[PDB]
Amino acid sequence: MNYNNKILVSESGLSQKHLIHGDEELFQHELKTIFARNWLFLTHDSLIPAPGDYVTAKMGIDEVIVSRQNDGSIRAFLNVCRHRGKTLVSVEAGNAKGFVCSYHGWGFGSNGELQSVPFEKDLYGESLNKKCLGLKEVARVESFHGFIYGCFDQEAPPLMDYLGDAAWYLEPMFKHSGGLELVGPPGKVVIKANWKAPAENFVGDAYHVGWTHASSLRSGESIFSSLAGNAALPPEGAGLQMTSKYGSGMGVLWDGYSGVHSADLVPELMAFGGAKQERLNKEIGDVRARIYRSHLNCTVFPNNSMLTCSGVFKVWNPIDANTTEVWTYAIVEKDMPEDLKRRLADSVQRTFGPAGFWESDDNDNMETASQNGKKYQSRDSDLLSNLGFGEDVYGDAVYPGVVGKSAIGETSYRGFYRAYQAHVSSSNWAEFEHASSTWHTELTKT
Amino acid sequence: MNYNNKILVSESGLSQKHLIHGDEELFQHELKTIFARNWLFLTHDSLIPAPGDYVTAKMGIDEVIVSRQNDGSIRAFLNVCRHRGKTLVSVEAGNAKGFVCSYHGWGFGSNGELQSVPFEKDLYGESLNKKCLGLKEVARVESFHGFIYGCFDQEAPPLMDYLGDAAWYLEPMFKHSGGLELVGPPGKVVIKANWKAPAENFVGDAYHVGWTHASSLRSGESIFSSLAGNAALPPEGAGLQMTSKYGSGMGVLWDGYSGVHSADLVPELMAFGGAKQERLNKEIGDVRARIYRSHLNCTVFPNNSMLTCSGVFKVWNPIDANTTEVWTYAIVEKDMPEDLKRRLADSVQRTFGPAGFWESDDNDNMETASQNGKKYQSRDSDLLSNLGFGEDVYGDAVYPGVVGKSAIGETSYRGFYRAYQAHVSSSNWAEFEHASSTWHTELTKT
Amino acid sequence: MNYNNKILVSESGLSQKHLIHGDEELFQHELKTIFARNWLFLTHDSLIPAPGDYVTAKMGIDEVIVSRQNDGSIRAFLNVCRHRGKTLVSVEAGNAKGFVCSYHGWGFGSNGELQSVPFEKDLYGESLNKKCLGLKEVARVESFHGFIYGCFDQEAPPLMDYLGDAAWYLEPMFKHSGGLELVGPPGKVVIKANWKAPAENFVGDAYHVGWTHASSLRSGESIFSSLAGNAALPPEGAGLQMTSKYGSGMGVLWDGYSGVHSADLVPELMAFGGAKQERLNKEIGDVRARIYRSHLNCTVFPNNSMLTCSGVFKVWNPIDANTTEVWTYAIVEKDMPEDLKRRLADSVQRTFGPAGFWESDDNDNMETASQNGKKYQSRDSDLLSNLGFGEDVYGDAVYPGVVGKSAIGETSYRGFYRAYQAHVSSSNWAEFEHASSTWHTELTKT
Amino acid sequence: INIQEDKLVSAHDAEEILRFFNCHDSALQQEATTLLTQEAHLLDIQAYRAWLEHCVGSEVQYQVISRELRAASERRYKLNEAMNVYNENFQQLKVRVEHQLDPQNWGNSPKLRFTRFITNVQAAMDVNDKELLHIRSNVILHRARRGNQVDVFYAAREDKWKRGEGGVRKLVQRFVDYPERILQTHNLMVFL
Amino acid sequence: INIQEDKLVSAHDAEEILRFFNCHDSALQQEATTLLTQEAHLLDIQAYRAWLEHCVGSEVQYQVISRELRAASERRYKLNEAMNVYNENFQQLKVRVEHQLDPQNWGNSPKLRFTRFITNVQAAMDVNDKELLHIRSNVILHRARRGNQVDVFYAAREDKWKRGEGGVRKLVQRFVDYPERILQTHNLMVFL
Amino acid sequence: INIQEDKLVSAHDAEEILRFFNCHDSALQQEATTLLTQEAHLLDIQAYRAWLEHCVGSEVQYQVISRELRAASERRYKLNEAMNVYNENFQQLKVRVEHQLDPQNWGNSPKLRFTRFITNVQAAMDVNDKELLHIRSNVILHRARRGNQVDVFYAAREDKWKRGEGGVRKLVQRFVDYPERILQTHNLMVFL
Ligand SMILES: CCSc1ccccc1
Ligand SMILES: CCSc1ccccc1
Ligand SMILES: CCSc1ccccc1
Ligand code: FES
Numbered sequence A, B, C: 001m002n003y004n005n006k007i008l009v010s011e012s013g014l015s016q017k018h019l020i021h022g023d024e025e026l027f028q029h030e031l032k033t034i035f036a037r038n039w040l041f042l043t044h045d046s047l048i049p050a051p052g053d054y055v056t057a058k059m060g061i062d063e064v065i066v067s068r069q070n071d072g073s074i075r076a077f078l079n080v081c082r083h084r085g086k087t088l089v090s091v092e093a094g095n096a097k098g099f100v101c102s103y104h105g106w107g108f109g110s111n112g113e114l115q116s117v118p119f120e121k122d123l124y125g126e127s128l129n130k131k132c133l134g135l136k137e138v139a140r141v142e143s144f145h146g147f148i149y150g151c152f153d154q155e156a157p158p159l160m161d162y163l164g165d166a167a168w169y170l171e172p173m174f175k176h177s178g179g180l181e182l183v184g185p186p187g188k189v190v191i192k193a194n195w196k197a198p199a200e201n202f203v204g205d206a207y208h209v210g211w212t213h214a215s216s217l218r219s220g221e222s223i224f225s226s227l228a229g230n231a232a233l234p235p236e237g238a239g240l241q242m243t244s245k246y247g248s249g250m251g252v253l254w255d256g257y258s259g260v261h262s263a264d265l266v267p268e269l270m271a272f273g274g275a276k277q278e279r280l281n282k283e284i285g286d287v288r289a290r291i292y293r294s295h296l297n298c299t300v301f302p303n304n305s306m307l308t309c310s311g312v313f314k315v316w317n318p319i320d321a322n323t324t325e326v327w328t329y330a331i332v333e334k335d336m337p338e339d340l341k342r343r344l345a346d347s348v349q350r351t352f353g354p355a356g357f358w359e360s361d362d363n364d365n366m367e368t369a370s371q372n373g374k375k376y377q378s379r380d381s382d383l384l385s386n387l388g389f390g391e392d393v394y395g396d397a398v399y400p401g402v403v404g405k406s407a408i409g410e411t412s413y414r415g416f417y418r419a420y421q422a423h424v425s426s427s428n429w430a431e432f433e434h435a436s437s438t439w440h441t442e443l444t445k446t
Numbered sequence D, E, F: 001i002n003i004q005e006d007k008l009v010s011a012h013d014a015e016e017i018l019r020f021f022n023c024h025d026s027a028l029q030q031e032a033t034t035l036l037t038q039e040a041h042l043l044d045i046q047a048y049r050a051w052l053e054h055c056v057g058s059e060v061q062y063q064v065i066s067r068e069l070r071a072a073s074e075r076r077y078k079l080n081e082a083m084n085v086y087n088e089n090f091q092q093l094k095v096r097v098e099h100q101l102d103p104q105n106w107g108n109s110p111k112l113r114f115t116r117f118i119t120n121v122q123a124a125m126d127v128n129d130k131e132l133l134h135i136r137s138n139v140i141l142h143r144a145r146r147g148n149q150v151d152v153f154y155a156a157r158e159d160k161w162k163r164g165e166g167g168v169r170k171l172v173q174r175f176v177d178y179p180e181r182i183l184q185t186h187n188l189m190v191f192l
C-alpha cells in the first residue's frame, strides 16, 4: 500500500477505510508514523516520586525504563541491553541506582550510562568505549502537571503545544484542582481489538453510551443513568465536543462530577466537586470552574484516554492490528480525603478495570469492529463519522478548538482521524505540519 | 508470485504445486479469485422456511446474514454494521423482522434496509441518507431444489449453468426423489488443513477409502465394507467419475444407497431406496433412477461437498492456508418416515460429524498434506493426479461431462484443479471463460 | 530487504543487526541460504545400527527419514509421500523394510524407491513410472566418527572440509578416545528464541557462565564452580577460543573433563579422563591428549551444538524467527563402564535437558534477546561481539584456525557471524567461497 | 430456584439442582467418586473393552450434544435446537471401541496419551426408582499425540448409574451438553 | 515453615499453611467440599440470585487482587502493591448480578457457558471464632461463548464461611491473589 | 484386564489397575487425599525446604520420563525407549531446591506463581510390604510468570509413600510418564 497516496481517511475525516482496524502492514507503518513520532503516556510523578524510583512502560511495541534521576528530573531508556540485546528489567516498578543485565552482568546506571562491565580490565583492557554504550534514550520526556509523556522523535512539538486546544479543557482538573495523583498499579488485560477502536470510543463517542451500556446504566446506579436503553436523550446544552490540531479531543458532559460511580459515591462526590467549584469560580471564572467538575471523555493522541471525574485513566498499548494490551489506572484529586481516594480507586476498577462491568459492555463492539477490518468484503468499506458535520465551529469566544456545541456527535472522531491520516501520509513532523496548515477549515467545511 | 503466469496446476490438471495447500499469499489471492467469484453454500429452505427466519453463514472468510423475506424470497447481507463496522448478529439462527446493532443502536430490516437510527431527528436531522446505508448485499442468491447458494460476483453464471454437467447426476436425488431436507444444526469443528484437502478428497477420491478407512470399514459394518485394508477391489463397472467446466465433480458408486451407514440401517435403507427407484424407472428412466439410489461423493466447487445416500453434507470454510472450519449437516429425503430421518441424521454425525469415526480417519492425511505444503523442500514439489488420464471421455451418449468409466481414479481431481487454475489466473468471469473454452479437450488429451 | 547489499553483520563480525533474531522474512531467507545449503545433524550410528533401523529428523523446517540400508550405508529422504504429499512416517524411530502411506497405501522401500502401489495393474496399468517416483532424497549424507550429517545441496564441501579447523579440536574426543555413542531418545522442548541465540551462546560464550549460571554453579557442585556470581575469573591460560572458515567454532577450557556434572560424578570422571589421557599422550602427543579431556563448547555451523566432557549434544531446530525446538542428547565414550554411561546420560538431562537446571538459567536471556529483535526501536540496533578483537591469530604453530588465546572472548561469535553473512548474501557455494577468500584476514584485522 | 427471577437459568438446570440440594448422603458421594475415578482410569489407559465390560450398562444411552447458538430472547424459531455428537447405544459404543482397537487405525500409531481430571462429584438416588443413581461430575480431558498435538476438553456430565451384572453399578445414561460450539480440538473423538 | 530458611515463602502464605496442618477434621473437609461444589453448580448454571441467597453472607468481602511485579530483593519501593479487580460488599455483588441478568446485557446473548472445577479443598475452624470456618480451594474456570471464544481461569481461593440465616453456612470473605499479571482472557468478568 | 484382548493396554498399566480394583479402603483414600493436598500446597507457595522435610523420604526416587514415539506394531527396534527428564535421589532434589532458593537465580524475580490441581486420587496398601502405600493421582500444574507467560502441565503420578521420621508418611517414589513428547512450556522446571 502506498501511504503517500492511499486515502485511508476521507476529506474532513468523514469516513475511514475499515481495513485500518485490521491491516498488519498498516500496523507496522503506524509503529513508524504514529508511535515513534508522537507523545505517549509513561507514568505519573506519584508512581516514581523519589530518586531511584523506576517503572517499565510500553511506547508502541517497545518497552522502556522510566527513572527518577538524582536531580529530580525523569529520563527514559529502551529496556534493552547494549551488549547482546537481552531485556534489562523484568519487573514493573521498583527503586534502584542501576540495572544489571542477567546475561553477562553489564551494569547500567539509573542515568542510562554503562557504569560497569565484569572483569573489564582483564577482558577489554582500555578498548571498550563505555561512553558510547549507554542505553538507547527516549529523546523527549515532558510533564503535564505530573503526567509524564515520552516521544522518540526529537522534532516533536513540546507536549503543551501538542495538546493544543485540548489543554484548556484539561487544566481545570489537571492544574487548578490542586493536582491529580495516579493510583497504581494498573489493571492489565489483553483484548482482541485494534488500539484505535477504544481510542476513538473515548475521544468522541457519547452516542454509544445509552445503548452499549444500557445494562450498566440500569444496574450500577450512577448519575448518567437516565440514558439506559436510549430511554432518554440528554437535553440541549448538556455538553459539547472538541478536537484539536494534533488529534487530541474530548466530550464534555456538563456537571457530571460523579461520572459512572454508583450511588454509594454520588452524594459525597457531588458535594466535594461542588465545594471546590465554588472556590475556583473566583480563580479561573465560572465557565472553567464548571469544566473542572464536568465529565470529560478524552483521548490524548494517539493511545492515552481518560474519563475525568470518573477517574478512569487508560493506555491502549498496541500489540498487532487485532491485539491491544489495556492498562487501567485511577486518577484522584490530591486534596481528597485518603478514604475517598481509596474508594474512588476501587470504583474505577469496579467499573472500568479488568473486571469492570462497564468496560465489559464494550468488548464485543471493539473486538468485532476491529476483526471485521480483516474480512475480505469489508476491507474497502467505509466506517462513518459524519454525525454533526457542518455544525462545528472554530475560534469560539468561550470554548477553543474545533467545537460541536452538542453532547452527542462525531466531531472528535473527525479531528482524531484527520491527524491520523496526516501522520500516516507524512515522513516527518515538517510534513505533518504542511499537511495540517488548514486543519480547522477542513473540519468545519459546509 | 505472479498468478497470471505461475503454473500452479499443470496441463490437463495432471499435477499441482504442493505450495497451493500452504501458501498464505495464495490463500489471500483465493479470497478474491475463488471465494468472491464463485457460488458458495449458504443454507436450505428447511432451515429458514418462514418469513423472518434467518441464519448466519460464512462466504469465504466473510460472514453473512441469510434471511427469508416476506415475499418468500431469500436475501443475504454482510453481517457488518454500516455505521462503524460492528458485527450485527451474534447468533447462528433465529426469527426477526430486523437486526439492531449493539454499539449505537442502528436498526436494519430483514431486507437489509437501514430502518431506524436512535434519536435521528435530534442528531442527524434530515442529513442522514438512510437509503444509501443498507447492509452490503450479496449480489446473487439462487436455489437448487431448496439448497441456497450465494455469490458476491454479479457476473457469475446462473447457479444451474455453474453446476454444468454435475446437475444431471444430482437431479435424481435432489429433484426426482420428491426433494431433500437439510437437518440442522450442523456440527462445527476446526481442522488444521487447507480447504482444498477435503474438497479434493470428496470430489474424486475413491482410491483412499479401502486404506484410509480400513478400521471404519471393518468395525462399522456398512455396505462398502468389502474394501477394508484393500482386501478387495470394487469389480469392473462398479461406478464412474465425472467432472465439469466450472469445477464441480463426483464419483458414482452404483447401488450404494445405504452408504457408510452401519448394519442397523442397511436393510431399511436398501428397501426404501429400491422401492423409490422402482417408481422412478417409469418417470426418469432406468439409468437415472439407478443414479438416484447410487452413492455420489461430490464437491460443488469450490468448498461444498456431500455424500448422497450416506446423507453427509459439508462446508469447508476457509480460515487460513492451514486452517478450515468444517460444517457438517445431514441430508434426508422429505418423504422418509420421521423416525428414519432422525436415525439417519444421527448416523451422519456418528460417521462424519465432530466425533465421526470415519471422518477421524481422514484427519492426519489432510492436515499433514496441507502442512507439508509450507515446508521448504516441498513447496515446489508436484502433487500427482494422473490416475486414469488418457481414458476419460466427453459427450458420452448416456453419462454427461468429462467421464472416467471406472469407480476409482483421479478424473475429478483434474477437472477441479483445471477450474481452480483458470480462476486463479483470471481477473474476472470473462477471463475464466476464455481460459476454459477448450476445457474438456484439455481433460481428455491422450 | 536486499540480502545482496544489506549489511547484517559488520566487517570482521564485530556486530550484527538485532533484527536478525526477529525478522521473519530473513528467517524464510535462511531456509534457503543457511539450512538448504549447509550440513545439518541427523543422527548417530548408535541410534540406527542395524539394517532397517530408521529415525526421523528435522533439517531446517523439513522432516526427513534417516534409514540404515542393507549395504550398511545410510540414506535420508523427505518424509513426504510422492503421491499427494501426506507425511509418510509418524513415529520417531523404529525398524522397517519400508514405509506405507496411510492415505492411498503407496509403499516405499527403506531405499526410498516406490516399491508398490495398491491395485497398480487394475488402476494404472503400465502407465505409472515408479522409477521416477522415489522419495525426494537428501543429496549428501556423511559421517564424522559415527555422527551423521545431511545436506540438501550437492555442491557443499565434504563434511570433513566443512568442519575446517574445528575438526582438529574434536578429533581427540571423537576419534582418538575410541569413539562416542549418542544416547537417545533426546529431550524435546520448544523455546521462544531464535535458533541463533543458543547457537551463538554455545559457539563462543564463556563470558556468560559465571553470571547467568551463578545459581547452578553455586548449587550444583561442579568443577567450574569457582565462577559463581563472577566471584572469580579463570586464570590466564585457562583456555582458548577458535573459529573456522565455514562458521564452526568452540571454546576450550583446559582440563575440565567433569564439566557441569555435580560432585557425585567428579572424582570418577576425573579419574577416567586422566587415565585415558595418559594413554593418548603416546599416540597423539601431550597437547592433543590434553584437548581430549578438556571441556569444549562447540557449535557445528549452523545449528548443532555440544559440550564435550559434559556430554551435552544439542540441535536447535528452527520453527520461526522466535521459535526453536531444542533436541538434547547425551554423548558418552564407548569404552566407559555401562553404569557410568547411564549416570552420565541422566546427568546430561539433569543439567541441560527439558528440566535441565543449567539450561533453565539461559531461557530468559535467549528468549528476550530474540524477541527484542522484533521491537521497532531495536531492529536497526547493533548487537556487539567485539571482545578480544585485535588479539586473534591465525596459523599458530600448535592451535589451528582463528584463535584467541584466552578462555573468555567473542572470537567464535565473529567467525560464526562472518560465515552467516557470507551465506545470506550468496546464491550458492561458489559465491560463498568468493565471499570467504580472505576470511581469516578479516577476523584478525588490527 | 425460581427461573422467572433467576432469568439466565434453564428449567432443565433448575431441576437438576433440586436433585442434589435435598437428601445428601456422604457415603453415596464417596461411592460415586470411586466409580468415576475407576472409570476414568480405565479410559486413560485405553482399556476400552474393560470400560464396556465393567462400566457400561447394556441399556446405555451415551449422548453428547452441540446446541445451536440462539438469541436469549428468541421465542419464535422452533427447529432442531441441537445435534448429536454422540448418541450411542451399547452396540454403537462397541463399534467405536472396535474402531479404536483395530490394528489398521493408523491414527493410533504412535499410541495416544490420555489424562482425565474428574471433579465436582455429586450423587443422589432417584426418588422413584430406588436403584437408579444420579451422578453429576465435571471432566477435563487432556489428549496428546504426535509430538506436539495437544487437545483439552471441558464438560459437565449428567449420569445415571444402575446395578447390573454381579451387582456392579454401571452407566445407563450419560448426557453432556458440550460447552464450546465450534470445536478447536480437531475432533471430539474422546469418551467424555 | 521458617521463612528465613524457606526464602521464597511469604509470611502470609506461611500463616495460612499453619492453619490446616494442625487440627485436621475429616468431616469438616467433606462439608467444605459439598459447600463449594454446590456453590460452583449454582454459578455454572448462572443462577446468580440463588448464589447470593444461598451462598453469600450479608457481611461479605469478595476480593480478587492483581499484584504488581516487583523485584524479589526489593526493599525500598513502598507504593500500593496491588489493585482490586474485585473488592465487593454484598450490595456491590448484587449490582454485578443485576448486570448479568439485565435483558439488555448484549454480551449475554447467545447464552454463555460456564464449567468450574474445584480441587484441593482444605478446611479448618478458626481458633478464636468457633463459628468461623476457613476453607481453601483451587478453581479452574472455563468460559465459552460466541462459537470460538474460550477463556480459562486458574486461582487459589482463601475463604471464610459462617453460619447465617437458617443456619446455612455462607461466604463472608473470599480472597484471591490472581496468578497471571496480564489477563489473556479478554476480561476477568467471572465469579471465581 | 486381558491385554491380548484389550490391545491398546500396556502390561504395566494393567498391573497398576489391578492394585486399586481389589481392596478398597475409603479411609486410606481420604488420608491419601490429605497427604497430596498438603504436598501441593507446600509446593504452590514455594516452600521447597518444607516440602523436602515434610513430604520427601530419604530413599526417594523422583522420576519423570519422556518416551520416544514408536510404532504400535514395532517389535524389532530395542534401544532406550525413554529418557529421564527427572531421575532424582534426595540429594539431587536438594540441589534443585537450593537452585530455586538461590538469590542469584535471576529467573525467579519477579516471583513465580504456581497453582496445582490434584484429582483422581486412589490409594492401596502394598500386599507384601504392609507399610508401603501406593497412591495414584493426576495433576494440572499452572505456572505464571513475567506478565504474560503461562504454562500448564498435565500428568498422572504413580507414587509410593512410606512412614518415616515421626511416623510421617513421605514420598519414596514418584513415577510420571509425561504425556506430551515435545514440551510446549519452555521447560519442565516444575515439581510434578
Ligand atoms: C467512553 C466515551 S463516553 C463516556 C461517557 C461516560 C462514561 C464512559 C464513556
Ligand atoms: C469421500 C470420497 S469417497 C467416499 C465414498 C464413500 C464414503 C466416503 C467417501
Ligand atoms: C555454553 C557456552 S560455555 C559453557 C561452558 C560450560 C558449560 C556450559 C556452557
Ligand atoms: S546481553 Fe546484557 S550483558 Fe550481555
Ligand code: FES
Residues within 6 Å of the ligand: B081, B082, B083, B084, B085, B086, B101, B102, B103, B104, B105, B106
Ligand atoms: S457500529 Fe453499529 S450502530 Fe454504530
Ligand code: FES
Residues within 6 Å of the ligand: C081, C082, C083, C084, C085, C086, C101, C102, C103, C104, C105, C106
Ligand atoms: S498421499 Fe500417499 S499414497 Fe496418496
Ligand SMILES: [Fe+3]
Residues within 6 Å of the ligand: A201, A208, A209, A212, A213, A358, A361, A362
Ligand atoms: Fe463504552
Ligand SMILES: [Fe+3]
Residues within 6 Å of the ligand: B201, B208, B209, B212, B213, B358, B361, B362
Ligand atoms: Fe475419507
Ligand SMILES: [Fe+3]
Residues within 6 Å of the ligand: C201, C208, C209, C212, C213, C358, C361, C362
Ligand atoms: Fe548458558
